[PDB]
PDB file of all heavy atoms in Angstrom:
ATOM      1  N   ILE A 146     -11.560  -0.713  -9.494  1.00  0.00           N
ATOM      2  CA  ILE A 146     -11.763   0.816  -9.608  1.00  0.00           C
ATOM      3  C   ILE A 146     -11.453   1.160 -10.983  1.00  0.00           C
ATOM      4  O   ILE A 146     -12.212   1.991 -11.670  1.00  0.00           O
ATOM      5  CB  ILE A 146     -10.699   1.493  -8.644  1.00  0.00           C
ATOM      6  CG1 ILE A 146     -11.163   1.095  -7.292  1.00  0.00           C
ATOM      7  CG2 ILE A 146     -10.993   2.902  -8.920  1.00  0.00           C
ATOM      8  CD1 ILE A 146     -10.359   1.750  -6.166  1.00  0.00           C
ATOM      9  N   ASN A 147     -10.243   0.690 -11.693  1.00  0.00           N
ATOM     10  CA  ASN A 147      -9.926   1.015 -12.952  1.00  0.00           C
ATOM     11  C   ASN A 147     -11.110   0.785 -13.967  1.00  0.00           C
ATOM     12  O   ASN A 147     -11.431   1.614 -14.798  1.00  0.00           O
ATOM     13  CB  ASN A 147      -8.601   0.431 -13.449  1.00  0.00           C
ATOM     14  CG  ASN A 147      -7.495   1.221 -12.878  1.00  0.00           C
ATOM     15  OD1 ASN A 147      -7.294   2.403 -12.738  1.00  0.00           O
ATOM     16  ND2 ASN A 147      -6.439   0.262 -12.357  1.00  0.00           N
ATOM     17  N   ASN A 148     -11.600  -0.442 -13.933  1.00  0.00           N
ATOM     18  CA  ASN A 148     -12.623  -0.884 -14.879  1.00  0.00           C
ATOM     19  C   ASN A 148     -13.879  -0.244 -14.458  1.00  0.00           C
ATOM     20  O   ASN A 148     -14.719   0.113 -15.487  1.00  0.00           O
ATOM     21  CB  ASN A 148     -12.688  -2.403 -14.937  1.00  0.00           C
ATOM     22  CG  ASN A 148     -13.725  -2.927 -15.949  1.00  0.00           C
ATOM     23  OD1 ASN A 148     -13.480  -2.854 -17.169  1.00  0.00           O
ATOM     24  ND2 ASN A 148     -14.924  -3.170 -15.619  1.00  0.00           N
ATOM     25  N   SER A 149     -14.162  -0.048 -13.302  1.00  0.00           N
ATOM     26  CA  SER A 149     -15.331   0.598 -12.763  1.00  0.00           C
ATOM     27  C   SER A 149     -15.466   2.039 -13.447  1.00  0.00           C
ATOM     28  O   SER A 149     -16.518   2.363 -14.083  1.00  0.00           O
ATOM     29  CB  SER A 149     -15.474   0.795 -11.247  1.00  0.00           C
ATOM     30  OG  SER A 149     -16.564   1.455 -10.877  1.00  0.00           O
ATOM     31  N   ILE A 150     -14.524   2.874 -13.044  1.00  0.00           N
ATOM     32  CA  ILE A 150     -14.673   4.294 -13.526  1.00  0.00           C
ATOM     33  C   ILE A 150     -14.697   4.253 -15.095  1.00  0.00           C
ATOM     34  O   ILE A 150     -15.190   5.180 -15.611  1.00  0.00           O
ATOM     35  CB  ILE A 150     -13.355   4.986 -12.973  1.00  0.00           C
ATOM     36  CG1 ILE A 150     -13.364   5.054 -11.500  1.00  0.00           C
ATOM     37  CG2 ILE A 150     -13.370   6.454 -13.636  1.00  0.00           C
ATOM     38  CD1 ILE A 150     -14.365   6.092 -10.934  1.00  0.00           C
ATOM     39  N   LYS A 151     -14.037   3.236 -15.741  1.00  0.00           N
ATOM     40  CA  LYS A 151     -13.984   3.246 -17.099  1.00  0.00           C
ATOM     41  C   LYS A 151     -15.363   3.111 -17.701  1.00  0.00           C
ATOM     42  O   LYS A 151     -15.645   3.593 -18.871  1.00  0.00           O
ATOM     43  CB  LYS A 151     -13.065   2.154 -17.672  1.00  0.00           C
ATOM     44  CG  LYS A 151     -12.993   1.922 -19.108  1.00  0.00           C
ATOM     45  CD  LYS A 151     -12.572   0.710 -19.543  1.00  0.00           C
ATOM     46  CE  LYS A 151     -12.588   0.475 -21.169  1.00  0.00           C
ATOM     47  NZ  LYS A 151     -12.214  -0.976 -21.467  1.00  0.00           N
ATOM     48  N   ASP A 152     -16.308   2.413 -16.991  1.00  0.00           N
ATOM     49  CA  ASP A 152     -17.656   2.317 -17.569  1.00  0.00           C
ATOM     50  C   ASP A 152     -18.425   3.589 -17.245  1.00  0.00           C
ATOM     51  O   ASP A 152     -19.115   4.061 -18.140  1.00  0.00           O
ATOM     52  CB  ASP A 152     -18.301   1.139 -16.923  1.00  0.00           C
ATOM     53  CG  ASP A 152     -17.664  -0.286 -17.118  1.00  0.00           C
ATOM     54  OD1 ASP A 152     -17.071  -0.432 -18.305  1.00  0.00           O
ATOM     55  OD2 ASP A 152     -17.627  -1.046 -16.303  1.00  0.00           O
ATOM     56  N   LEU A 153     -18.333   4.025 -16.109  1.00  0.00           N
ATOM     57  CA  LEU A 153     -18.972   5.284 -15.660  1.00  0.00           C
ATOM     58  C   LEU A 153     -18.650   6.375 -16.439  1.00  0.00           C
ATOM     59  O   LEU A 153     -19.469   7.400 -16.483  1.00  0.00           O
ATOM     60  CB  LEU A 153     -18.802   5.444 -14.036  1.00  0.00           C
ATOM     61  CG  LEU A 153     -19.275   4.308 -13.175  1.00  0.00           C
ATOM     62  CD1 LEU A 153     -18.855   4.785 -11.705  1.00  0.00           C
ATOM     63  CD2 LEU A 153     -20.679   4.247 -13.325  1.00  0.00           C
ATOM     64  N   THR A 154     -17.561   6.420 -17.138  1.00  0.00           N
ATOM     65  CA  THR A 154     -17.184   7.606 -17.910  1.00  0.00           C
ATOM     66  C   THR A 154     -17.171   7.121 -19.324  1.00  0.00           C
ATOM     67  O   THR A 154     -16.242   7.502 -20.190  1.00  0.00           O
ATOM     68  CB  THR A 154     -15.799   8.166 -17.541  1.00  0.00           C
ATOM     69  OG1 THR A 154     -14.755   7.256 -17.910  1.00  0.00           O
ATOM     70  CG2 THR A 154     -15.773   8.382 -16.064  1.00  0.00           C
ATOM     71  N   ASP A 155     -17.972   6.320 -19.692  1.00  0.00           N
ATOM     72  CA  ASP A 155     -18.142   5.676 -20.968  1.00  0.00           C
ATOM     73  C   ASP A 155     -16.989   5.324 -21.872  1.00  0.00           C
ATOM     74  O   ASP A 155     -16.829   5.396 -23.033  1.00  0.00           O
ATOM     75  CB  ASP A 155     -19.084   6.682 -21.787  1.00  0.00           C
ATOM     76  CG  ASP A 155     -20.381   6.957 -21.250  1.00  0.00           C
ATOM     77  OD1 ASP A 155     -21.143   6.146 -21.020  1.00  0.00           O
ATOM     78  OD2 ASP A 155     -20.486   8.182 -20.724  1.00  0.00           O
ATOM     79  N   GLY A 156     -15.884   5.186 -21.260  1.00  0.00           N
ATOM     80  CA  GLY A 156     -14.668   4.821 -21.804  1.00  0.00           C
ATOM     81  C   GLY A 156     -13.596   5.901 -21.819  1.00  0.00           C
ATOM     82  O   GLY A 156     -12.506   5.668 -22.377  1.00  0.00           O
ATOM     83  N   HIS A 157     -13.988   7.003 -21.471  1.00  0.00           N
ATOM     84  CA  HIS A 157     -12.986   8.296 -21.614  1.00  0.00           C
ATOM     85  C   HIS A 157     -11.883   8.072 -20.582  1.00  0.00           C
ATOM     86  O   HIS A 157     -10.937   8.791 -20.810  1.00  0.00           O
ATOM     87  CB  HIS A 157     -13.894   9.468 -21.395  1.00  0.00           C
ATOM     88  CG  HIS A 157     -14.630  10.025 -22.625  1.00  0.00           C
ATOM     89  ND1 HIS A 157     -14.165  10.829 -23.668  1.00  0.00           N
ATOM     90  CD2 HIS A 157     -15.973   9.645 -23.044  1.00  0.00           C
ATOM     91  CE1 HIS A 157     -14.980  10.972 -24.481  1.00  0.00           C
ATOM     92  NE2 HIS A 157     -16.121  10.266 -24.176  1.00  0.00           N
ATOM     93  N   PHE A 158     -12.074   7.248 -19.634  1.00  0.00           N
ATOM     94  CA  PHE A 158     -10.990   7.256 -18.573  1.00  0.00           C
ATOM     95  C   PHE A 158     -10.619   5.762 -18.412  1.00  0.00           C
ATOM     96  O   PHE A 158     -11.203   5.068 -17.598  1.00  0.00           O
ATOM     97  CB  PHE A 158     -11.239   7.917 -17.241  1.00  0.00           C
ATOM     98  CG  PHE A 158     -11.409   9.418 -17.337  1.00  0.00           C
ATOM     99  CD1 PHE A 158     -12.694  10.129 -17.486  1.00  0.00           C
ATOM    100  CD2 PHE A 158     -10.296  10.099 -17.309  1.00  0.00           C
ATOM    101  CE1 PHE A 158     -12.664  11.391 -17.676  1.00  0.00           C
ATOM    102  CE2 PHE A 158     -10.337  11.620 -17.439  1.00  0.00           C
ATOM    103  CZ  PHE A 158     -11.434  12.203 -17.612  1.00  0.00           C
ATOM    104  N   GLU A 159      -9.570   5.313 -19.101  1.00  0.00           N
ATOM    105  CA  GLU A 159      -8.978   3.945 -19.122  1.00  0.00           C
ATOM    106  C   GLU A 159      -8.414   3.495 -17.756  1.00  0.00           C
ATOM    107  O   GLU A 159      -8.885   2.488 -17.180  1.00  0.00           O
ATOM    108  CB  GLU A 159      -7.900   3.922 -20.150  1.00  0.00           C
ATOM    109  CG  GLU A 159      -8.010   2.624 -20.963  1.00  0.00           C
ATOM    110  CD  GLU A 159      -9.313   2.483 -21.661  1.00  0.00           C
ATOM    111  OE1 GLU A 159      -9.867   3.461 -22.264  1.00  0.00           O
ATOM    112  OE2 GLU A 159      -9.829   1.248 -21.690  1.00  0.00           O
ATOM    113  N   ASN A 160      -7.326   4.180 -17.265  1.00  0.00           N
ATOM    114  CA  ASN A 160      -6.744   3.823 -16.061  1.00  0.00           C
ATOM    115  C   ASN A 160      -6.670   4.873 -15.076  1.00  0.00           C
ATOM    116  O   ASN A 160      -5.520   5.414 -14.815  1.00  0.00           O
ATOM    117  CB  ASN A 160      -5.265   3.176 -16.333  1.00  0.00           C
ATOM    118  CG  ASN A 160      -5.068   1.887 -15.738  1.00  0.00           C
ATOM    119  OD1 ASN A 160      -5.550   0.969 -16.272  1.00  0.00           O
ATOM    120  ND2 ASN A 160      -4.173   1.882 -14.713  1.00  0.00           N
ATOM    121  N   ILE A 161      -7.844   5.307 -14.549  1.00  0.00           N
ATOM    122  CA  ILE A 161      -7.962   6.317 -13.567  1.00  0.00           C
ATOM    123  C   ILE A 161      -6.876   6.276 -12.497  1.00  0.00           C
ATOM    124  O   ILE A 161      -6.409   7.367 -12.005  1.00  0.00           O
ATOM    125  CB  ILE A 161      -9.250   6.343 -13.055  1.00  0.00           C
ATOM    126  CG1 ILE A 161      -9.484   7.667 -12.257  1.00  0.00           C
ATOM    127  CG2 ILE A 161      -9.509   5.210 -12.212  1.00  0.00           C
ATOM    128  CD1 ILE A 161      -9.440   8.941 -13.127  1.00  0.00           C
ATOM    129  N   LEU A 162      -6.322   5.138 -12.176  1.00  0.00           N
ATOM    130  CA  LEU A 162      -5.310   5.114 -11.140  1.00  0.00           C
ATOM    131  C   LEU A 162      -3.854   5.046 -11.725  1.00  0.00           C
ATOM    132  O   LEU A 162      -3.566   4.394 -12.675  1.00  0.00           O
ATOM    133  CB  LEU A 162      -5.555   3.708 -10.411  1.00  0.00           C
ATOM    134  CG  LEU A 162      -6.815   3.555  -9.473  1.00  0.00           C
ATOM    135  CD1 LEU A 162      -7.081   2.336  -8.953  1.00  0.00           C
ATOM    136  CD2 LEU A 162      -6.796   4.750  -8.532  1.00  0.00           C
ATOM    137  N   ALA A 163      -3.094   5.921 -11.073  1.00  0.00           N
ATOM    138  CA  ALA A 163      -1.660   5.950 -11.510  1.00  0.00           C
ATOM    139  C   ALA A 163      -0.821   4.934 -10.881  1.00  0.00           C
ATOM    140  O   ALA A 163      -1.297   3.978 -10.347  1.00  0.00           O
ATOM    141  CB  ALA A 163      -1.099   7.399 -11.101  1.00  0.00           C
ATOM    142  N   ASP A 164       0.403   5.170 -11.214  1.00  0.00           N
ATOM    143  CA  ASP A 164       1.520   4.114 -10.701  1.00  0.00           C
ATOM    144  C   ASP A 164       1.342   3.962  -9.250  1.00  0.00           C
ATOM    145  O   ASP A 164       1.041   2.771  -8.699  1.00  0.00           O
ATOM    146  CB  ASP A 164       2.926   4.656 -11.059  1.00  0.00           C
ATOM    147  CG  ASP A 164       3.148   4.999 -12.490  1.00  0.00           C
ATOM    148  OD1 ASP A 164       2.872   4.059 -13.450  1.00  0.00           O
ATOM    149  OD2 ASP A 164       3.415   6.210 -12.773  1.00  0.00           O
ATOM    150  N   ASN A 165       1.719   4.899  -8.421  1.00  0.00           N
ATOM    151  CA  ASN A 165       1.672   5.028  -7.026  1.00  0.00           C
ATOM    152  C   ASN A 165       0.669   5.751  -6.408  1.00  0.00           C
ATOM    153  O   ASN A 165       0.790   6.423  -5.421  1.00  0.00           O
ATOM    154  CB  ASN A 165       3.021   5.475  -6.478  1.00  0.00           C
ATOM    155  CG  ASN A 165       4.298   4.766  -7.094  1.00  0.00           C
ATOM    156  OD1 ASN A 165       5.477   5.160  -6.883  1.00  0.00           O
ATOM    157  ND2 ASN A 165       4.023   3.716  -7.768  1.00  0.00           N
ATOM    158  N   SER A 166      -0.529   5.695  -6.867  1.00  0.00           N
ATOM    159  CA  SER A 166      -1.707   6.289  -6.352  1.00  0.00           C
ATOM    160  C   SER A 166      -2.366   5.593  -5.142  1.00  0.00           C
ATOM    161  O   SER A 166      -3.004   6.178  -4.453  1.00  0.00           O
ATOM    162  CB  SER A 166      -2.843   6.502  -7.412  1.00  0.00           C
ATOM    163  OG  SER A 166      -2.285   7.561  -8.428  1.00  0.00           O
ATOM    164  N   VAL A 167      -2.081   4.242  -5.076  1.00  0.00           N
ATOM    165  CA  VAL A 167      -2.712   3.457  -3.993  1.00  0.00           C
ATOM    166  C   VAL A 167      -1.804   2.278  -3.829  1.00  0.00           C
ATOM    167  O   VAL A 167      -1.260   1.615  -4.705  1.00  0.00           O
ATOM    168  CB  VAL A 167      -4.094   2.895  -4.371  1.00  0.00           C
ATOM    169  CG1 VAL A 167      -5.198   4.087  -4.320  1.00  0.00           C
ATOM    170  CG2 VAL A 167      -4.130   2.239  -5.826  1.00  0.00           C
ATOM    171  N   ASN A 168      -1.693   1.875  -2.508  1.00  0.00           N
ATOM    172  CA  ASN A 168      -0.887   0.793  -2.018  1.00  0.00           C
ATOM    173  C   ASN A 168      -1.715   0.113  -0.766  1.00  0.00           C
ATOM    174  O   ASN A 168      -2.688   0.410  -0.392  1.00  0.00           O
ATOM    175  CB  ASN A 168       0.390   1.251  -1.687  1.00  0.00           C
ATOM    176  CG  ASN A 168       0.503   2.232  -0.584  1.00  0.00           C
ATOM    177  OD1 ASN A 168      -0.118   3.323  -0.609  1.00  0.00           O
ATOM    178  ND2 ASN A 168       1.166   1.875   0.590  1.00  0.00           N
ATOM    179  N   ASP A 169      -0.937  -0.833  -0.197  1.00  0.00           N
ATOM    180  CA  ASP A 169      -1.386  -1.619   0.978  1.00  0.00           C
ATOM    181  C   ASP A 169      -1.914  -0.686   2.030  1.00  0.00           C
ATOM    182  O   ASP A 169      -2.762  -1.000   2.863  1.00  0.00           O
ATOM    183  CB  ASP A 169      -0.274  -2.562   1.584  1.00  0.00           C
ATOM    184  CG  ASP A 169       0.176  -3.663   0.557  1.00  0.00           C
ATOM    185  OD1 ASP A 169      -0.497  -4.732   0.577  1.00  0.00           O
ATOM    186  OD2 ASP A 169       1.150  -3.490  -0.167  1.00  0.00           O
ATOM    187  N   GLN A 170      -1.339   0.578   2.142  1.00  0.00           N
ATOM    188  CA  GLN A 170      -1.530   1.526   3.227  1.00  0.00           C
ATOM    189  C   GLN A 170      -2.789   2.509   2.872  1.00  0.00           C
ATOM    190  O   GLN A 170      -3.015   3.369   3.704  1.00  0.00           O
ATOM    191  CB  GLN A 170      -0.355   2.211   3.631  1.00  0.00           C
ATOM    192  CG  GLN A 170      -0.350   2.743   5.038  1.00  0.00           C
ATOM    193  CD  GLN A 170      -0.216   1.649   5.981  1.00  0.00           C
ATOM    194  OE1 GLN A 170      -0.445   1.801   7.200  1.00  0.00           O
ATOM    195  NE2 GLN A 170       0.091   0.445   5.415  1.00  0.00           N
ATOM    196  N   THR A 171      -3.376   2.383   1.891  1.00  0.00           N
ATOM    197  CA  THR A 171      -4.379   3.409   1.446  1.00  0.00           C
ATOM    198  C   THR A 171      -5.694   3.232   2.365  1.00  0.00           C
ATOM    199  O   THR A 171      -6.309   2.103   2.292  1.00  0.00           O
ATOM    200  CB  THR A 171      -4.863   3.142  -0.062  1.00  0.00           C
ATOM    201  OG1 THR A 171      -3.868   3.564  -0.938  1.00  0.00           O
ATOM    202  CG2 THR A 171      -6.057   4.142  -0.237  1.00  0.00           C
ATOM    203  N   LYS A 172      -6.046   4.189   2.952  1.00  0.00           N
ATOM    204  CA  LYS A 172      -7.094   4.303   3.897  1.00  0.00           C
ATOM    205  C   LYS A 172      -8.429   4.764   3.298  1.00  0.00           C
ATOM    206  O   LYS A 172      -9.529   4.162   3.266  1.00  0.00           O
ATOM    207  CB  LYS A 172      -6.865   5.010   5.231  1.00  0.00           C
ATOM    208  CG  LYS A 172      -5.551   4.580   5.853  1.00  0.00           C
ATOM    209  CD  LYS A 172      -5.802   3.162   6.453  1.00  0.00           C
ATOM    210  CE  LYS A 172      -4.352   2.438   6.404  1.00  0.00           C
ATOM    211  NZ  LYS A 172      -3.307   3.279   7.083  1.00  0.00           N
ATOM    212  N   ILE A 173      -8.426   6.165   2.781  1.00  0.00           N
ATOM    213  CA  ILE A 173      -9.512   6.682   2.244  1.00  0.00           C
ATOM    214  C   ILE A 173      -8.972   7.266   0.796  1.00  0.00           C
ATOM    215  O   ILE A 173      -7.889   7.636   0.734  1.00  0.00           O
ATOM    216  CB  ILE A 173     -10.036   7.789   3.015  1.00  0.00           C
ATOM    217  CG1 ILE A 173     -10.889   7.198   4.279  1.00  0.00           C
ATOM    218  CG2 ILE A 173     -10.977   8.709   2.245  1.00  0.00           C
ATOM    219  CD1 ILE A 173     -11.219   8.451   5.221  1.00  0.00           C
ATOM    220  N   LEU A 174      -9.830   7.101  -0.157  1.00  0.00           N
ATOM    221  CA  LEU A 174      -9.450   7.606  -1.476  1.00  0.00           C
ATOM    222  C   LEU A 174     -10.532   8.408  -2.187  1.00  0.00           C
ATOM    223  O   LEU A 174     -11.678   7.860  -2.447  1.00  0.00           O
ATOM    224  CB  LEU A 174      -9.044   6.390  -2.355  1.00  0.00           C
ATOM    225  CG  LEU A 174      -8.568   6.710  -3.697  1.00  0.00           C
ATOM    226  CD1 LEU A 174      -7.287   7.454  -3.717  1.00  0.00           C
ATOM    227  CD2 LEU A 174      -8.527   5.384  -4.551  1.00  0.00           C
ATOM    228  N   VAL A 175     -10.240   9.637  -2.592  1.00  0.00           N
ATOM    229  CA  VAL A 175     -11.120  10.412  -3.400  1.00  0.00           C
ATOM    230  C   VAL A 175     -10.687  10.332  -4.913  1.00  0.00           C
ATOM    231  O   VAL A 175      -9.685  10.440  -5.289  1.00  0.00           O
ATOM    232  CB  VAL A 175     -11.063  11.883  -2.985  1.00  0.00           C
ATOM    233  CG1 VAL A 175     -11.922  12.796  -3.862  1.00  0.00           C
ATOM    234  CG2 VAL A 175     -11.354  12.044  -1.516  1.00  0.00           C
ATOM    235  N   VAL A 176     -11.819  10.014  -5.613  1.00  0.00           N
ATOM    236  CA  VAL A 176     -11.637   9.899  -7.097  1.00  0.00           C
ATOM    237  C   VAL A 176     -12.698  10.640  -7.884  1.00  0.00           C
ATOM    238  O   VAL A 176     -13.893  10.366  -7.727  1.00  0.00           O
ATOM    239  CB  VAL A 176     -11.692   8.470  -7.569  1.00  0.00           C
ATOM    240  CG1 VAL A 176     -11.606   8.320  -8.997  1.00  0.00           C
ATOM    241  CG2 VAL A 176     -10.652   7.697  -6.786  1.00  0.00           C
ATOM    242  N   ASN A 177     -12.309  11.711  -8.669  1.00  0.00           N
ATOM    243  CA  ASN A 177     -13.090  12.557  -9.416  1.00  0.00           C
ATOM    244  C   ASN A 177     -12.849  12.378 -10.886  1.00  0.00           C
ATOM    245  O   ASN A 177     -11.649  12.782 -11.244  1.00  0.00           O
ATOM    246  CB  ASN A 177     -12.951  14.003  -8.992  1.00  0.00           C
ATOM    247  CG  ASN A 177     -13.260  14.200  -7.559  1.00  0.00           C
ATOM    248  OD1 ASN A 177     -13.079  15.272  -7.122  1.00  0.00           O
ATOM    249  ND2 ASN A 177     -13.777  13.170  -6.865  1.00  0.00           N
ATOM    250  N   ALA A 178     -13.627  11.840 -11.568  1.00  0.00           N
ATOM    251  CA  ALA A 178     -13.347  11.698 -13.108  1.00  0.00           C
ATOM    252  C   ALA A 178     -14.633  12.264 -13.841  1.00  0.00           C
ATOM    253  O   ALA A 178     -15.734  11.697 -13.596  1.00  0.00           O
ATOM    254  CB  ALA A 178     -13.218  10.119 -13.456  1.00  0.00           C
ATOM    255  N   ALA A 179     -14.336  13.373 -14.617  1.00  0.00           N
ATOM    256  CA  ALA A 179     -15.469  13.877 -15.346  1.00  0.00           C
ATOM    257  C   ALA A 179     -15.159  14.272 -16.749  1.00  0.00           C
ATOM    258  O   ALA A 179     -13.857  14.582 -16.901  1.00  0.00           O
ATOM    259  CB  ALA A 179     -15.916  15.093 -14.581  1.00  0.00           C
ATOM    260  N   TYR A 180     -15.964  14.290 -17.727  1.00  0.00           N
ATOM    261  CA  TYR A 180     -15.643  14.567 -19.055  1.00  0.00           C
ATOM    262  C   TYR A 180     -16.832  15.343 -19.639  1.00  0.00           C
ATOM    263  O   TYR A 180     -17.886  15.321 -18.845  1.00  0.00           O
ATOM    264  CB  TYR A 180     -15.304  13.403 -19.844  1.00  0.00           C
ATOM    265  CG  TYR A 180     -16.437  12.645 -20.426  1.00  0.00           C
ATOM    266  CD1 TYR A 180     -16.953  13.026 -21.704  1.00  0.00           C
ATOM    267  CD2 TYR A 180     -16.996  11.657 -19.671  1.00  0.00           C
ATOM    268  CE1 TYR A 180     -18.056  12.265 -22.082  1.00  0.00           C
ATOM    269  CE2 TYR A 180     -18.132  10.910 -20.220  1.00  0.00           C
ATOM    270  CZ  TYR A 180     -18.545  11.252 -21.485  1.00  0.00           C
ATOM    271  OH  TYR A 180     -19.710  10.420 -22.074  1.00  0.00           O
ATOM    272  N   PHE A 181     -16.680  15.945 -20.746  1.00  0.00           N
ATOM    273  CA  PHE A 181     -17.680  16.600 -21.300  1.00  0.00           C
ATOM    274  C   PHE A 181     -17.463  17.177 -22.780  1.00  0.00           C
ATOM    275  O   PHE A 181     -16.495  17.787 -23.002  1.00  0.00           O
ATOM    276  CB  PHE A 181     -18.050  17.832 -20.412  1.00  0.00           C
ATOM    277  CG  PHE A 181     -19.121  18.818 -21.137  1.00  0.00           C
ATOM    278  CD1 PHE A 181     -20.395  18.310 -21.575  1.00  0.00           C
ATOM    279  CD2 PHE A 181     -18.971  20.091 -21.231  1.00  0.00           C
ATOM    280  CE1 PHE A 181     -21.282  19.148 -22.074  1.00  0.00           C
ATOM    281  CE2 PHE A 181     -19.874  21.036 -21.781  1.00  0.00           C
ATOM    282  CZ  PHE A 181     -21.043  20.537 -22.200  1.00  0.00           C
ATOM    283  N   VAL A 182     -18.236  16.708 -23.597  1.00  0.00           N
ATOM    284  CA  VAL A 182     -18.118  17.101 -25.090  1.00  0.00           C
ATOM    285  C   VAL A 182     -19.177  18.035 -25.326  1.00  0.00           C
ATOM    286  O   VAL A 182     -20.411  17.813 -25.326  1.00  0.00           O
ATOM    287  CB  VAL A 182     -18.211  15.873 -26.050  1.00  0.00           C
ATOM    288  CG1 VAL A 182     -17.833  16.161 -27.365  1.00  0.00           C
ATOM    289  CG2 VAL A 182     -17.496  14.681 -25.470  1.00  0.00           C
TER     290      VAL A 182
END
């Protein structure tokens, strides 16, 4: 996911995932990464 979103946002978002954003118990996960120059 980290590397994926990094390509889709042309590199603007390096580590979209935080420290404790996901663990063994994550069921569903919403991720919105957008940028604009």
Side-chain angles (χ1 to χ4, degrees):
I146 300 181
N147 281 316
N148 186 73
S149 174
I150 299 288
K151 180 196 173 185
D152 300 320
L153 297 177
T154 72
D155 308 293
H157 281 270
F158 291 98
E159 223 58 45
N160 234 71
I161 190 63
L162 295 173
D164 309 298
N165 306 172
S166 290
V167 291
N168 60 300
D169 295 276
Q170 208 71 193
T171 293
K172 306 297 150 50
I173 285 172
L174 178 72
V175 174
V176 177
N177 301 169
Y180 82 89
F181 173 54
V182 193

